Design a protein around this nucleic acid. Structure first.
Length: 88
DNA sequence: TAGCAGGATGTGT
DNA sequence: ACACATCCTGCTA
């Protein structure tokens, strides 16, 4: 079973030493993160899944599919490149 | 420019 | 079934 996108995102967020210039917690407790380097996050996701055509347009389309699943959501005050984990 | 909401359909297990 | 990936239009900062 391939890694899921939400888990992949949590993985990058776990190690700011390695990935902090690409993606970071804005509010760790509330699960609010910012994508700082969208092209880079998409590039890393494409490598992980072996989709060399992956880009942020398509990565973010998959994040949006999470809205109705209650996995990721946009924060109360919506901001570009800012997202929020619903649970843990 | 670049990101964002969500439909339709292709891909691979 | 499931989780995307890949196309799309229209919308928004």
């Amino acid at each position: 079973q391939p890694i899921h996108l939400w888990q992949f995102l949590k993985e990058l967020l776990l190690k700011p030493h390695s990935y902090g210039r690409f993606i970071r917690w804005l509010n760790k407790e509330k699960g609010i993160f910012k994508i700082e380097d969208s092209a880079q996050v998409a590039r890393l996701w494409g490598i992980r899944k072996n989709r060399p055509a992956m880009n942020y347009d398509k990565l973010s389309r998959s994040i949006r599919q999470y809205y109705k699943k209650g996995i990721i959501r946009k924060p109360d005050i919506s901001q570009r490149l800012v997202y929020q984990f619903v649970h843990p």
